[PDB]
Amino acid sequence: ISADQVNQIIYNLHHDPFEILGCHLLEEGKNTKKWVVRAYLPKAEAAWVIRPTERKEDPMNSVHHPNFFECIIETPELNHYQLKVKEGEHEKVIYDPYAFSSPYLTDEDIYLFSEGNHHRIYEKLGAHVGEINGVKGVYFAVWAPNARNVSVIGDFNNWDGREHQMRKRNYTIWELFVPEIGSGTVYKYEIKNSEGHIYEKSDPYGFYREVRPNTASIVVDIDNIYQWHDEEWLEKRRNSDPLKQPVSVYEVHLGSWLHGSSAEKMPLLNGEADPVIVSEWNPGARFLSYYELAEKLIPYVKDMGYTHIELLPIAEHPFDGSWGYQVTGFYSPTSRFGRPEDFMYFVDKCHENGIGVILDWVPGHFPKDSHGLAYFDGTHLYEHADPRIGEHKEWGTLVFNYGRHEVRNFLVANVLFWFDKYHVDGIRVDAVASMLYRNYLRKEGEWIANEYGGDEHIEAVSFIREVNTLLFEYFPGILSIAEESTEWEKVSRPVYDGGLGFNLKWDMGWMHDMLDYFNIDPYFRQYHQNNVTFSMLYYYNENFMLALSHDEIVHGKSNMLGKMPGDEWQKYANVRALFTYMYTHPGKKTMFMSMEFGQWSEWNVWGDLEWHLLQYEPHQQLKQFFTDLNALYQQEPALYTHDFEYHGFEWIDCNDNTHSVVSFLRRSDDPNDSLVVVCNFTPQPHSHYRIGVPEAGYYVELFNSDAKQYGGSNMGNLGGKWADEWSFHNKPYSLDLCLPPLAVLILKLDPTKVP
Numbered sequence: 001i002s003a004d005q006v007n008q009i010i011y012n013l014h015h016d017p018f019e020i021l022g023c024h025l026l027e028e029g030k031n032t033k034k035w036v037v038r039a040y041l042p043k044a045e046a047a048w049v050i051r052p053t054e055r056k057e058d059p060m061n062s063v064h065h066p067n068f069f070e071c072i073i074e075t076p077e078l079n080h081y082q083l084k085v086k087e088g089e090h091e092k093v094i095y096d097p098y099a100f101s102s103p104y105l106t107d108e109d110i111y112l113f114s115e116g117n118h119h120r121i122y123e124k125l126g127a128h129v130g131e132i133n134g135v136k137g138v139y140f141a142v143w144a145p146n147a148r149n150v151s152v153i154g155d156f157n158n159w160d161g162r163e164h165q166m167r168k169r170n171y172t173i174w175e176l177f178v179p180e181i182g183s184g185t186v187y188k189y190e191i192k193n194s195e196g197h198i199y200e201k202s203d204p205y206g207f208y209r210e211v212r213p214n215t216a217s218i219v220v221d222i223d224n225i226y227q228w229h230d231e232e233w234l235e236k237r238r239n240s241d242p243l244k245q246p247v248s249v250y251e252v253h254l255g256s257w258l259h260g261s262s263a264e265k266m267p268l269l270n271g272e273a274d275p276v277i278v279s280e281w282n283p284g285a286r287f288l289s290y291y292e293l294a295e296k297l298i299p300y301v302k303d304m305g306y307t308h309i310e311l312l313p314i315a316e317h318p319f320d321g322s323w324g325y326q327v328t329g330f331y332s333p334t335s336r337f338g339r340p341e342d343f344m345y346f347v348d349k350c351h352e353n354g355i356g357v358i359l360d361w362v363p364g365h366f367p368k369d370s371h372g373l374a375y376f377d378g379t380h381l382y383e384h385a386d387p388r389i390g391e392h393k394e395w396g397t398l399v400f401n402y403g404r405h406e407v408r409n410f411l412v413a414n415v416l417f418w419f420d421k422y423h424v425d426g427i428r429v430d431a432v433a434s435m436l437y438r439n440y441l442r443k444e445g446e447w448i449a450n451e452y453g454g455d456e457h458i459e460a461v462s463f464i465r466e467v468n469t470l471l472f473e474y475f476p477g478i479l480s481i482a483e484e485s486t487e488w489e490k491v492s493r494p495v496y497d498g499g500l501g502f503n504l505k506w507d508m509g510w511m512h513d514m515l516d517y518f519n520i521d522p523y524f525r526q527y528h529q530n531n532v533t534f535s536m537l538y539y540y541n542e543n544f545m546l547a548l549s550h551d552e553i554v555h556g557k558s559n560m561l562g563k564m565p566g567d568e569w570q571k572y573a574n575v576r577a578l579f580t581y582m583y584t585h586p587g588k589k590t591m592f593m594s595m596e597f598g599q600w601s602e603w604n605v606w607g608d609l610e611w612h613l614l615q616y617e618p619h620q621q622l623k624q625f626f627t628d629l630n631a632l633y634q635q636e637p638a639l640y641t642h643d644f645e646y647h648g649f650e651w652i653d654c655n656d657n658t659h660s661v662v663s664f665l666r667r668s669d670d671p672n673d674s675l676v677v678v679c680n681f682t683p684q685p686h687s688h689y690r691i692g693v694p695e696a697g698y699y700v701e702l703f704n705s706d707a708k709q710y711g712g713s714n715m716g717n718l719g720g721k722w723a724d725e726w727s728f729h730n731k732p733y734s735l736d737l738c739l740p741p742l743a744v745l746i747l748k749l750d751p752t753k754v755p
């Protein structure tokens, strides 16, 4: 390019910057092609073009002007790229603002969609505000190969779609532009199918929806509703290894943490809206908005000292009772709690407080609700047609045909959508086994094997590995967490080593062992010492997340205090002990709302949490305890930097099962960071209990769960103890401790202390 062309851009004299900016073909070779990407980034001193699916990065050179950049690349096709932009000392990664000339689908868009590789198909399918033939309007587009006709119905045409019949393209996608309408437009797709029957359907790629039980889609100008502020956060994420950082997740179901009065409107960000009543049986109650939650949930979480919030699903879902796990609008956050901008606001604010957001994501199945994807075009479009692989009969739900390109594309792009438009920091996937196995919840004669006669679901595995490959490529530094409950190997290991590509897996065995353990009378724990110690045999085969989730305090399993035997005092001590042992055991951490203040009732998705308990000491003491434990978690690198390496953990002694006692070390880079952890899992205190340590010195009591201010009896070691030249559990020096009742001690060597 010439300097005249650049100056036209710089001084706002150029007629159409799309001629010059963005990606442009220069020439075609035998094997490959020469492209140039061009960018005008004011205030940027440097820029690169990332080709994350190819694992490459090229620098852009300033050209004719310091903020005008060109960068030439040879590669056959250049569909997938981002720009990294440096502005002083900060860097952001973003998609090219000049990627798409026009709002309609190009040959290239469609071609890619049909291979199932259009990672930004959500820019073209759905409904989008744009200009065509010189008029502002909305472009609508939908995948429906076998429909006989489709039309767009909505507010703008009194739900009569005769003047709004869509044009079928390439035998696959229906489109229509509608002028003069824009964002706020309420709409659906009238579809007539193969056999003449005419249903009405929500937009699969819709970005907003009416409040349930209504299902019409709404048009959103998704790129012009919210200003973000989290460039710093995103940069820190992109450049860090979340595996070597503290991760304590507060697990939350938004619709049931706290409610408000239906007697008043729901405040949004600079706006307000009608209240969403929580049930016809609790009509005085309303949901809080994403806006109100950002004001209340975030400071609560920040104070408690959790590093993350993990949401039960928030994709639009029609029945509160599914908890979210049965989704019908994959590409819209639920309208229960307000508008997309309001959720954007929530995430921005989590980030402003250095808290990340993880989203429960539901790619495994969808419900038969007819407004949704089921039998979309009058065929088995999204779901497989064989019910032996396309239904989950016990659940009454449909399974996506992962081998069908446009279906795979729907989900792969959807995951990418949430990181893109909503800036989220990770995902969790429920019940991965449901995807992996071709015989999941099926009995003999009722399922067909793969082509090699295995039970493995080849298409599902491919899909999961694509998801995790792309996600880490486009957004490094994120968390992809899996619950998979069947010994399937390498779940949280890399795709190149034949993993599924998650970087964390819920340790379900641990959970079961821990809760089964704590549930047993203390006297009898001596027969079950192996619940404590078993986990560490298999531990290092995966990067484990230690979760005590929502699923464990429903369906008459009781809340955590409920599971514990003994009187009220012992009940609380068992919680402190379990959770202190959890925060010291190797792994990342997850716990669910209400666990942190001792809720007695099981979690009930139809009400909010029993917040009135916080007005009584025991609950407040327990909440303080969790506040201090989180604070310690974050301040003690031996507790997070080597979670997944041998160096990080070694048992001191776990053989005194008659007293249910176990002891261990945790380690970091620095040897002065090493911790001694001593657990006593019965109400019997111990007066002169010797533990072996590896070095002489004063060991400080860093933490002691029996402290008075946590509800404990206040037995302990008065702040620390001098080690002895006295060999024990195979170590040179040793400690003669007071072990408090149902308690855990965390001690650290202070090598700069006065003998």
Ligand SMILES: OC[C@H]1O[C@H](O[C@H]2[C@H](O)[C@@H](O)[C@@H](O[C@H]3[C@H](O)[C@@H](O)[C@@H](O[C@H]4[C@H](O)[C@@H](O)[C@@H](O[C@H]5[C@H](O)[C@@H](O)[C@@H](O[C@H]6[C@H](O)[C@@H](O)[C@@H](O)O[C@@H]6CO)O[C@@H]5CO)O[C@@H]4CO)O[C@@H]3CO)O[C@@H]2CO)[C@H](O)[C@@H](O)[C@@H]1O
Residues within 6 Å of the ligand: 628, 701, 702, 703, 704, 705, 707, 708, 709, 714, 715, 716, 717, 718, 719, 720, 721, 736
């Ligand atoms: O996260 C929770 C919380 O945990 C820790 O603090 C708690 C601590 O673990 C717990 O034991 C207690 O400690 C308090 C204590 O309540 C106070 O009384 C005060 O203790 C002083 C004590 O009054 C003095 O007697 C003096 O102790 C002397 C002993 O009297 C001597 O006999 C000798 O002790 C030896 C003992 O007799 C023998 O059996 C031998 O085998 O071993 C002993 C070695 O000590 O020497 C001591 C040393 O002076 O001095 C005490 C210190 O002033 O203060 C204690 C510490 O605050 O309650 C704590 C709070 O609930 C953790 O340290 C906190 O950071 C953390 O917040």
Ligand SMILES: OC[C@H]1O[C@H](O[C@H]2[C@H](O)[C@@H](O)[C@@H](O[C@H]3[C@H](O)[C@@H](O)[C@@H](O[C@H]4[C@H](O)[C@@H](O)[C@@H](O)O[C@@H]4CO)O[C@@H]3CO)O[C@@H]2CO)[C@H](O)[C@@H](O)[C@@H]1O
Residues within 6 Å of the ligand: 145, 146, 171, 172, 403, 404, 405, 406
């Ligand atoms: O007049 C045009 C033709 O119309 C009819 O064929 C249709 C099908 O009925 C449609 O449902 C559609 O099917 C696509 C499908 O959408 C797409 O995913 C892809 O399917 C792949 C699949 O991903 C892959 O895993 C493997 O199974 O192979 C499949 C086949 O390639 O492609 C399908 C077929 O193109 O497309 C056409 C066109 O609308 C009619 O039956 C034809 O006889 C007729 O010529």
Ligand SMILES: OC[C@H]1O[C@H](O[C@H]2[C@H](O)[C@@H](O)[C@@H](O[C@H]3[C@H](O)[C@@H](O)[C@@H](O[C@H]4[C@H](O)[C@@H](O)[C@@H](O)O[C@@H]4CO)O[C@@H]3CO)O[C@@H]2CO)[C@H](O)[C@@H](O)[C@@H]1O
Residues within 6 Å of the ligand: 566, 567, 569, 570, 683, 684, 685, 713, 714, 715, 741
């Ligand atoms: O200093 C006096 C005593 O010190 C030590 O007692 C310990 C116990 O060994 C621990 O088990 C624990 O006691 C708990 C007890 O386990 C729990 O069930 C509960 O019992 C209370 C009860 O709630 C209360 O209403 C009434 O029954 O009194 C009981 C108290 O004895 O609560 C206890 C804690 O308050 O902690 C104590 C104190 O550290 C020591 O072992 C005893 O020899 C000694 O007498």
Ligand SMILES: OC[C@H]1O[C@H](O[C@H]2[C@H](O)[C@@H](O)[C@@H](O[C@H]3[C@H](O)[C@@H](O)[C@@H](O)O[C@@H]3CO)O[C@@H]2CO)[C@H](O)[C@@H](O)[C@@H]1O
Residues within 6 Å of the ligand: 159, 186, 188, 200, 210, 214, 215, 216
């Ligand atoms: O004040 C008018 C009216 O508006 C609200 O209902 C709207 C719903 O959001 C929506 O479902 C849509 O209704 C259409 C259906 O979606 C469609 O499938 C088909 O059956 O036609 C319907 C319109 O005739 O739009 C309605 C109407 O605006 C509100 O909930 C109503 O109670 C209120 O009376």
Ligand SMILES: [Mg+2]
Residues within 6 Å of the ligand: 259, 607, 608, 609
């Ligand atoms: Mg309530």
